[PDB]
């Protein structure tokens, strides 16, 4: 398998296009009718940074959960002793671009647990193989991955 380059995204189109993760449907807040669509991921093979100390990083859509949980497996197979790490999932702080899929539970920013930046190119590649609908090597510090809305 081939790792992504810094700033490469796959598919090589904009995130909110139909070929990728598709339309942004609306921010989901904690008191919203739509908050019920998010379920917390408690997978022990995933590290959630949760620096917010709210659990918000664990919240994501069913489809995001499926792809993340598949990725958790391939990460452990790629690097014995290493785990998938999420630094941002659903966000209620407002610290992404206006209209970010994080506000809707459809995106994660990820690293490896050991925080070896040299692994992140390959991490992104595994995220693509796990079926994330858009994967972007957004930063030296993390990969951004998103999914399509629930059908």
Ligand X SMILES: O=C(O)[C@@H]1O[C@@H](O)[C@H](OS(=O)(=O)O)[C@@H](O)[C@@H]1O[C@H]1O[C@H](COS(=O)(=O)O)[C@@H](O[C@@H]2O[C@@H](C(=O)O)[C@@H](O[C@H]3O[C@H](COS(=O)(=O)O)[C@@H](O[C@@H]4O[C@@H](C(=O)O)[C@@H](O[C@H]5O[C@H](COS(=O)(=O)O)[C@@H](O)[C@H](O)[C@H]5NS(=O)(=O)O)[C@H](O)[C@H]4OS(=O)(=O)O)[C@H](O)[C@H]3NS(=O)(=O)O)[C@H](O)[C@H]2OS(=O)(=O)O)[C@H](O)[C@H]1NS(=O)(=O)O
Ligand Y SMILES: O=C(O)[C@@H]1O[C@@H](O[C@H]2[C@H](O)[C@@H](NS(=O)(=O)O)[C@@H](O[C@H]3[C@H](O)[C@@H](OS(=O)(=O)O)[C@H](O[C@H]4[C@H](O)[C@@H](NS(=O)(=O)O)[C@@H](O[C@H]5[C@H](O)[C@@H](OS(=O)(=O)O)[C@H](O[C@H]6[C@H](O)[C@@H](NS(=O)(=O)O)[C@@H](O)O[C@@H]6COS(=O)(=O)O)O[C@H]5C(=O)O)O[C@@H]4COS(=O)(=O)O)O[C@H]3C(=O)O)O[C@@H]2COS(=O)(=O)O)[C@H](OS(=O)(=O)O)[C@@H](O)[C@@H]1O
Q: Which residues bind ligand X (CB under 6 A)?
A: 49, 87, 115, 117, 139-141
Per CB under 8 A, the list member of 23, 29, 52, 150 interacting with its own copies is 52
No. of H helices and E strands in the chain?
2, 8
**Positions in 115-144 near Zn ion (CB under 5 A):** 144
Binding-site partner at residue 109 among Zn ion, its own copies, Cl ion, none, CB < 5 to 8 Å by type: Zn ion
* Residue 55 contacts its own copies per CB under 8 A: yes
Binding-site partner at residue 91 among ligand Y, Cl ion, Ca ion, none, CB < 5 to 8 Å by type: Ca ion
> How many residues lie near ligand Y (CB under 6 A)?
8
**Positions in 33-92 near Ca ion (CB under 5 A):** 49, 57, 88, 91
Tell whether 142 is in a known binding site: no
Give Cα separations from 63 to 52, 77, 89, 118 (angstroms). Answer: 23, 22, 13, 28
Q: What is the spatial distance between Cα 69 and Cα 127, in angstroms, rounded to a whole number?
A: 10
Tell whether 91 is in a known binding site: yes
Q: Smallest gap, in angstroms, from Cβ of residue 11 to Ca ion?
A: 26
Tell whether 39 is in a known binding site: no
Q: What is the spatial distance between Cα 14 and Cα 134, in angstroms, rounded to a whole number?
A: 9
């Amino acid at each position: 398998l081939t790792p992504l380059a810094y700033k490469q995204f796959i598919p090589n189109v904009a995130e909110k296009t139909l070929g990728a993760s598709g339309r942004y449907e609306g921010k989901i807040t904690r008191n919203s009718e739509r908050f019920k669509e998010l379920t917390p991921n408690y997978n022990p093979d995933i590290i959630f940074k949760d620096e917010e100390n709210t659990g918000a990083d664990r919240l994501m859509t069913q489809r995001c959960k499926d792809k993340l949980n598949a990725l958790a497996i391939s990460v452990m197979n790629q690097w014995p002793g290493v785990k998938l790490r999420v630094t941002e999932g659903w966000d209620e702080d407002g610290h992404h671009s206006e209209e970010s899929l994080h506000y809707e539970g459809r995106a994660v920013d990820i690293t490896t647990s050991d925080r070896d930046r040299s692994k992140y190119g390959m991490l992104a590649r595994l995220a693509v193989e796990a079926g994330f609908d858009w994967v972007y090597y957004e930063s030296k510090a993390h990969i951004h991955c998103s999914v399509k809305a629930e059908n």
